[PDB]
Write a structure and sequence with these properties.
This is part of a larger assembly, with chains A, B, C and D.
Chain A lengths: L1 E7 L3 E6 L5 E6 L4 E5 L4 E6 L6 E6 L5 E6 L3 E6 L4 E7 L5 E6 L5 E6 L3 E6 L4 E7 L5 E6 L5 E6 L3 E6 L1 H8 L23 E7 L5 E6 L5 E6 L3 E7 L4 E8 L5 E6 L5 E6 L3 E6 L5 E6 L5 E6 L6 E5 L2 E6 L7 E4 L2 E6 L2 E6 L5 E6 L10 E5 L4 E6 L8 E6 L15 E4 L2 E6 L2 E5 L5 E5 L4 E5 L6 E4 L4 E5 L3 E6 L4 E7 L5 E4 L5 E5 L3 E6 L4 E6 L4 E6 L5 E5 L2 E5 L5 E6 L5 E6 L2 E5 L5 E4 L1
Antiparallel strand pairs in A: 1-28, 2-3, 3-4, 4-5, 6-7, 7-8, 8-9, 10-11, 11-12, 12-13, 14-15, 15-16, 16-17, 18-19, 19-20, 20-21, 22-23, 23-24, 24-25, 26-27, 27-28, 29-30, 30-31, 31-32, 33-34, 34-35, 35-36, 37-38, 38-39, 39-40, 41-42, 42-43, 43-44, 45-46, 46-47, 47-48, 49-50, 50-51, 51-52, 53-54, ...
Chain B lengths: L1 E3 L3 H8 L1
Chain C lengths: L5 E3 L7 E9 L3 E10 L5 E11 L2 E3 L6 E3 L4 E10 L5 E11 L8 E3 L3 E3 L5 E3 L4 H10 L2 E6 L7 H12 L2 E2 L3 H4 L5 E10 L4 E9 L11 E8 L2 H18 L2
Antiparallel strand pairs in C: 1-2, 2-3, 3-7, 4-6, 4-8, 5-7, 8-9, 8-10, 11-14, 12-16, 13-14, 14-15, 15-16
Classes of the chains: A mainly beta, B alpha+beta, C alpha+beta, D alpha/beta.
């Protein structure tokens, strides 16, 4: 788990990510709604008009609106630009558990302990439909992301799928005559014909707390007080249980599909978040807290960001490191995308898959080192336990067929980091923090014991940069001597100029630019996390934060070039063009 | 570099 | 010259250029922000969003403006100072473009740093009062000396100038070249907050005559913010002289 | 109370739905472009007006023909700020006015969004729509701001007087 942001507050019952802004709404048990910027780690605003716990919260996808639903039986619709409640929807008779906006229609879906699901038109401020049929508290109701379907979860031990296609036809038909249906009082005790139960999913032994649709497949995930997460498949005529994920030891509060991977995330009152493989139904990862129960899970629609609400606040996290593994040499970019090593020529813009990587690494490639002389690549993979870290040595085939890239047999071995030192030799940092020099056959040619070395970086032919806790040392591998040292804590990336005259040392919040002797020329402190950088042909270091493209000159002058909507990894800068990789490993050019 | 001192003098001053 | 207080907030490649004139008064900070539309598009609801860090409070939220193509406007914002703490003002310029699906709705401003030195005045007390306050004060900040200065007296004078603190230790007690110096410093804020510092510095004889001054500065105050802000100011001043 | 059927049509974003809910609820409803129709009953001077607000998107304009039957009054809403689509609004209005089912319908034109600084005035819209070329049809143009509600009640007062004299 890569924690990005963490809040301390009263119990978080609801979470919603803003689709475009780096914002998250948190609804608290004390009636307060908090709006946070998770990039800046700041509270933007607070909304406190609800009389008691707020459980339902959702951002509108396009409008400057959010909806909240509380134990006060009120649904409030808010304009976050105006920082005011626009109106309150009244009609539920008991606690509102969930509130969601429809993705196309001006509808709000609400689920309540009154055993009803209500659809509201937020433009007309009217209840348009009441879904009746659950015999207990309706803990969750969600719209299908593309179809006129609703899924609901209830303490009646059932998950129900509702067809709302009738509701759409009635409200969108332009020829609906002025019939004075002053029908205030006709709560037709017989369920309104506009929404029909399509499927009833029975199989939980206790109350169901959450249900969610799969974003693209006809799958439903449900979490219940039976401590099970169930996967359901539906078609037009039938729905059935596919399988059950077992391993929670208390009530499952929320379960969601991963929006981009075949993974299920569930959280539970057992103080754990579990990640499940959707195909194998096995627990891939488990995250625990010592004292705080989990209540709600949210996934960001467009980013690999998750949020979990617990008794003591909220966590915003990532499952995986989205940083692409890449190496730049001259006009060629080598980068890893999925299972393929790709080669991009910056001049021709030709992006070709050069080879297929060996299947079976559970962990993404952490770093890559390219050797242009032997056309060989070192791919470093870090395990969750650093001692189990591996590197793969591949030779890139010359005749790469772009449609069917060859799968060369890579030599896998144990090591923390592997970096090229010479044309026919590479250095490996072993699990024992010892420096192993290997040949192209992966044979140990020299063993060098280095005190306090956590990481190694390339520093020219025969030289390495060794990172300790508080310094970087330039080390000659042949002479086994330290040449120079610079004080900088926890350097993550080292970027040399094209002529090797200058080096940029990238820490989490600091950039130190040094000359070839490791004399510090400038030190830049950033409040925002530094992501990547590249040297321009002019000798300017262009770097990226999470929010900006910035420049730094060797004299210490630095500034903002451009705001970034998404964090990007700079690969090369040429004139007015910044070549970069996005978090999806797509090459982009920014002017 | 911020440290809370918990000396007998600081306790006696706080109690005074 | 007003020019010495002009701080550039955005770059020339930004769709909205901004610069601020920062005027620090005794209890309030006036930001006069020039905003220039560098685009051919009409910027609707162009809003200066300010956020403060420390004991700074924004008095009024800037109103949204509409900027014509290549038009300019001044936005004044007042920030109140409640205590003697290091403040940082963060901001964004947010705008809506009519009709163009531009992905850029936000320009991020440069951080504006408020200096604690405008609130600190040199003060005098007796050695007995200093020792009593030094024992009684709850918050200590220990700053490690990290300077390129080789003279102990030049380093003390640099700290006195950079902190606006008065040296209480008499010149005779500082006299003579022994490679060791200790001095007591005292200041008061305009809010009546007492700040004490002890400077304990040495010349590391084993590193030669060109060795930089080494040691510790201890700052004591009743408030956490005062001790923290003075410590950060001393750390920043020492790093500027290392260039 | 006399019941009167009114069809409210016009291009997308003309503010039709904002006019309808401003008259009924007194409030400004921030509306997304209407992808359908709304039906609301508004009472003015003991006449019950059943107003049909039909969406003005290109895909919905072919469906306006289904609402012509039994229409006693036509309200055409024009965005007075949208100079580019005024000719399109004229063609669509002229196409509707050529329908035999609308022959006896009274025409009210709302020149909406007059609060905007670049808005065409009611006289300029009258010429651009060619309303002076209409023979044998009672028409009126009213400058309106749907957000303030200005001119909406004057337009309804004209419509109520015309529809009262037609029997």
């Amino acid at each position: 788990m890569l924690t990005k942001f963490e809040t301390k507050s009263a119990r978080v019952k609801g979470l919603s990510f803003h689709p475009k802004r780096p914002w998250i709404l948190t609804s608290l048990h004390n009636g307060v709604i908090q709006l946070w910027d998770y990039r800046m780690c700041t509270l933007i605003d607070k909304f406190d008009e609800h009389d008691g716990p707020v459980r339902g919260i959702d951002f509108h996808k396009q409008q400057p609106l959010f909806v909240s639903g509380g134990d006060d039986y009120k649904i409030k619709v808010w304009n976050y630009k105006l920082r005011r409640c626009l109106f309150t929807l009244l009609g539920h008779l008991d606690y509102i558990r969930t509130t969601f906006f429809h993705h196309e229609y001006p509808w709000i879906l609400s689920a309540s302990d009154d055993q009803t699901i209500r659809v509201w038109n937020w433009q007309s401020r009217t209840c348009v439909c009441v879904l009746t049929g659950h015999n207990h508290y309706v803990m969750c109701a969600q719209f299908h992301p593309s179809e006129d379907l609703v899924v609901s979860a209830s303490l009646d031990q059932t998950v129900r799928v509702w067809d709302i296609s009738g509701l759409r036809k009635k409200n969108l038909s332009p020829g609906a005559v002025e019939s004075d249906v002053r029908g205030i009082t006709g709560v037709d005790l017989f369920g309104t014909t506009d929404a029909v139960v399509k499927h009833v999913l029975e199989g939980h032994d206790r109350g169901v707390n959450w249900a969610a649709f799969h974003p693209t497949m006809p799958l439903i995930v449900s979490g219940a007080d039976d401590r099970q997460v169930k996967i359901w498949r539906m078609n037009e005529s039938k729905a059935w249980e596919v399988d059950t994920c077992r391993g929670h030891y208390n009530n499952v509060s929320c379960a969601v599909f991963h929006p981009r991977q075949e993974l299920i995330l569930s959280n539970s009152e057992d103080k754990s978040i579990r990640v499940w493989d959707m195909s194998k139904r096995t627990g891939v990862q488990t995250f625990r807290r010592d004292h705080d129960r989990f209540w709600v899970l949210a996934a960001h629609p467009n980013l690999n960001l998750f949020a979990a609400g617990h008794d003591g606040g909220m966590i915003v996290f990532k499952l995986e490191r989205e940083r692409p593994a890449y190496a730049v040499h001259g006009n060629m970019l080598h980068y890893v995308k999925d299972r393929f090593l790709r080669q991009l020529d910056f001049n021709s813009s030709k992006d070709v898959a050069v080879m297929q990587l060996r299947s079976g690494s559970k962990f993404p490639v952490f770093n890559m080192s390219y050797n242009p002389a032997e056309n060989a690549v070192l791919l470093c993979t870090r395990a969750s336990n650093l001692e189990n870290s591996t590197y793969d040595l591949y030779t890139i085939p010359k005749d790469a067929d772009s449609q069917n890239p060859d799968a060369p047999e890579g030599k896998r071995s144990s090591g923390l980091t592997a970096v090229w030192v010479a044309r026919n030799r590479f250095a490996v940092l072993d699990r024992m923090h010892s420096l192993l020099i290997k040949n192209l056959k992966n044979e140990i040619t020299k063993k060098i014991q280095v005190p306090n070395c956590d990481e190694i970086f390339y520093a020219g032919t025969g030289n390495l940069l060794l990172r300790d806790a508080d310094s970087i040392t330039l080390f000659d591998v042949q002479q086994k001597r330290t040449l120079a040292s610079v004080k900088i804590s926890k350097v993550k990336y080292v970027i040399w100029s094209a002529d090797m005259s200058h080096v940029a040392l990238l820490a989490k919040h600091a950039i130190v630019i040094c000359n070839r002797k490791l004399d510090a020329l400038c030190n830049i402190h950033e409040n925002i996390r530094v992501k990547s950088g590249a040297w321009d042909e002019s000798g300017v270091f262009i770097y990226t934060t999470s929010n900006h493209i910035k420049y730094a000159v060797t004299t210490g002058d630095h500034g903002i070039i451009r705001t970034l909507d998404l964090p990007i990894y700079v690969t090369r800068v040429k004139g007015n063009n910044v070549y970069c990789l996005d978090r999806e490993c797509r090459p982009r050019v920014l002017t | 570099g911020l440290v809370q001192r918990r000396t007998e003098a600081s306790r006696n001053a706080a109690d005074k | 010259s007003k020019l010495n207080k002009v701080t550039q907030l955005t770059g020339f490649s930004d769709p909205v250029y901004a610069e601020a004139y920062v005027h620090v008064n005794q209890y309030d900070i006036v930001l006069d922000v020039l905003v220039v539309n560098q685009t051919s598009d009409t910027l609707q609801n162009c809003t200066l969003e300010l956020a403060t860090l420390g004991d700074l409070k924004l008095v009024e939220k800037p109103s949204p403006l509409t900027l014509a193509p290549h038009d300019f406007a001044n936005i004044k914002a007042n920030v109140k100072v409640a205590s003697t703490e290091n403040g940082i003002i963060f901001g964004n310029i947010v705008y809506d473009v009519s009709g163009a699906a531009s992905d850029r709705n936000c320009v991020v401003l440069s951080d504006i740093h408020i200096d604690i030195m405008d609130y600190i005045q040199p003060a005098t007390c007796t050695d007995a009062e200093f020792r009593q306050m030094w024992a009684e004060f709850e918050w200590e900040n220990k700053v490690t000396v990290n300077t390129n200065m080789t003279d102990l007296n030049d380093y003390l004078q640099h700290i006195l100038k950079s902190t606006n603190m008065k040296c209480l230790t008499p010149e005779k007690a500082l006299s003579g070249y022994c490679g060791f110096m200790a001095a007591n410093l005292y200041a008061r804020s305009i809010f009546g907050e007492d700040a004490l510092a002890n400077v304990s510095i040495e010349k590391p004889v084993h590193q030669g005559p060109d060795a930089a001054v080494t040691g510790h500065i201890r700052i004591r105050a009743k408030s956490q913010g005062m001790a923290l802000s003075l410590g950060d100011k001393i750390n920043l001043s020492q790093k500027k002289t290392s260039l | 109370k006399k019941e009167m059927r009114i069809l409210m049509v016009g291009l997308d974003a003309a503010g039709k739905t904002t006019i309808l809910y401003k008259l009924k609820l007194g409030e400004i409803v921030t509306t997304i472009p209407t992808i359908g129709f709304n039906v609301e009953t508004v009472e003015y001077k003991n006449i019950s007006f059943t107003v049909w607000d039909v969406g003005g998107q290109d895909k919905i304009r072919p469906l306006w023909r289904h609402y012509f039957q039994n229409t006693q009054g036509l309200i055409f809403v024009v965005d007075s700020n949208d100079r580019e689509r005024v000719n399109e609004a004229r063609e669509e209005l002229m196409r509707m006015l050529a329908e035999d089912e609308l022959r006896d319908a009274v025409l009210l034109v709302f020149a909406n969004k007059q609060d905007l600084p670049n808005a065409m005035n009611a006289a300029e819209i009258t010429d651009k729509l060619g309303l002076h070329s209409l023979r044998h049809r009672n028409w009126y143009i009213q400058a309106t701001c749907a957000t303030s509600g200005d001119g909406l009640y004057e337009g309804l007062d004209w419509l109520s007087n015309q529809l009262r004299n037609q029997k």
